[PDB]
C-alpha cells in the first residue's frame, strides 16, 4: 500500500489517534544513506590507491611516467602494484602473489590487442603481463571535461584531471583482473572464449564463498550506450 495507518489501542476508551504515514520519506532517507555510504567507500578506495602509488617512491607525475617509453621499470611497477591492489580488494586475507610476473611493454599497433589493453597471459607456468603504453597514454590524455555537467538523469597538487586518470587506471586494471581471474578459475579455452565475449563473468562472481561482495568500482552507477 502507498500509505500506512497507525491506530493506538487505548484501554477502556473510544477516543483514538488514527495517524497515516507514507513510505516515501523512509525510502528517500534509505536511498540517501545508501548513496552516501557508497560514495564514501569509493573515495576511500581511491585514497588507498593514491597513497600506495605515493609510497612507490616515484619522483615524476603519473602521466609523465606513462609517457617515458625509454624506461619500462616504472610502468611495470605501477601495473604490478595496481593488480596487487585489486587482488587485495577481492581477497583481503592474501596480499602477495605466489608466482613471478614478467612485464613486457609494447609500442606498436601489431602488439595492440583491438580494445583490451592490459593483455594478461601465462606461458610455462609463469604469468606474463603485456601492456600497450600508447593506448594508455591516449586514454590518459583526452582532455577530460571538468565543467559541472551532472547528467545523472534517471598543499597537494591533485586536480580533477588527475583523479580521473587514477580512476581510469583502476577501471582498466579491473577489467584486466577480471579476465585474469576467469583464466585462473578455468581453462585457457575459457579465457580465450571470454576475451571475445565478456559474457562469462556471471559464473560465480556474485556474492559467494569463492567470490566475496565488493563494489568492484563499476556497480556504483548503472550506465549504457544510447544507440538505437
Amino acid at each position: 500500500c502507498n500509505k500506512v495507518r497507525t491506530v493506538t489501542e487505548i484501554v477502556n476508551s473510544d477516543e483514538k489517534i488514527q495517524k497515516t504515514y507514507e513510505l516515501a520519506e523512509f525510502d528517500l532517507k534509505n536511498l540517501s544513506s545508501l548513496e552516501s555510504y557508497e560514495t564514501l567507500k569509493i573515495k576511500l578506495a581511491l585514497s588507498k590507491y593514491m597513497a600506495m602509488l605515493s609510497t612507490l617512491e616515484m619522483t615524476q607525475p603519473l602521466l609523465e611516467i606513462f609517457r617515458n617509453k625509454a624506461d619500462t621499470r616504472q610502468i611495470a611497477a605501477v601495473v604490478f602494484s595496481t593488480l596487487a591492489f585489486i587482488h587485495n580488494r577481492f581477497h583481503p586475507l592474501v596480499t602477495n602473489f605466489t608466482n613471478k610476473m614478467e612485464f613486457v611493454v609494447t609500442e606498436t599497433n601489431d602488439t595492440s590487442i583491438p580494445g583490451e589493453p592490459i593483455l594478461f597471459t601465462e606461458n610455462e607456468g609463469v604469468l606474463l603481463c603485456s601492456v600497450d603504453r600508447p593506448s594508455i597514454v591516449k586514454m590518459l590524455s583526452r582532455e577530460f571535461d571538468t565543467e559541472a555537467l551532472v547528467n545523472f538523469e534517471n598543499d597537494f597538487s591533485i586536480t580533477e584531471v588527475e583523479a580521473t586518470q587514477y580512476l581510469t587506471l583502476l577501471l582498466t586494471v579491473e577489467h584486466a583482473y577480471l579476465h585474469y581471474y576467469i583464466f585462473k578459475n578455468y581453462g585457457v579455452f575459457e579465457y580465450c572464449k571470454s576475451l571475445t565475449d565478456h559474457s562469462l563473468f556471471t559464473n560465480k562472481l556474485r556474492s559467494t564463498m569463492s567470490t566475496k561482495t565488493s563494489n568492484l568500482l563499476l556497480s556504483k552507477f548503472k550506465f549504457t550506450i544510447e544507440d538505437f
Binding site: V4, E9, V11, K29, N30, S33, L34
Partner: peptide
C-alpha cells in the same frame, strides 16, 4: 538509516498487541 527491513507490522505490532491483550481480562 540502518538500511534494514524491519517487521512491517509484526514486531512493534506484537509488542503493542501483547501489551494490550495482557491489559485485558
Amino acid at each position: 538509516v540502518s538500511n534494514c527491513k524491519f517487521n512491517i507490522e509484526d514486531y512493534n505490532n506484537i509488542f503493542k498487541v501483547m501489551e494490550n491483550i495482557r491489559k485485558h481480562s
